[PDB]
């Protein structure tokens, strides 16, 4: 699996509506192209992917 280092999170927009009204972006340094699984560890926010 790819190795992710220096992960940083910045929120572009945020609207607390019924649908997915927020967008966030992650910047990182990796070593190879691959797939990673994303998760939110609080139920305040629900990822779409």
Partner 1 sequence: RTCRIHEISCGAHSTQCIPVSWRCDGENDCDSGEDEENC
Q: In the complex, what is the shortest distance from the CB of residue 32 to partner 1, in angstroms, rounded to a whole number?
A: 7
Asked if 35 touches partner 1 (CB under 8 A), the answer is yes
- Using alpha carbons, select from 8, 3, 7 the residue that is nearest to residue 30: 3
Q: Encoding tokens for residue 10?
A: 């910045």
Asked if 32 touches partner 1 (CB under 8 A), the answer is yes
- Using alpha carbons, select from 47, 9, 11, 48 the residue that is nearest to residue 28: 9
Q: In the complex, what is the shortest distance from the CB of residue 21 to partner 1, in angstroms, rounded to a whole number?
A: 24
- Residue that the structure tokens 């629900």 belong to: 46
Binding positions for partner 1, 2-31, rule CB under 8 A? none
| Sites of contact with partner 1 (CB under 8 A) | 32-35
């Amino acid at each position: 699996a790819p190795t992710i280092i220096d992960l940083t999170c910045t929120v572009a927009t945020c609207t607390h509506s019924s649908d997915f009204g927020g967008v966030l972006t992650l910047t990182y340094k990796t070593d190879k192209n691959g797939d990673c699984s994303v998760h939110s560890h609080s139920n305040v926010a629900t990822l779409q992917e």
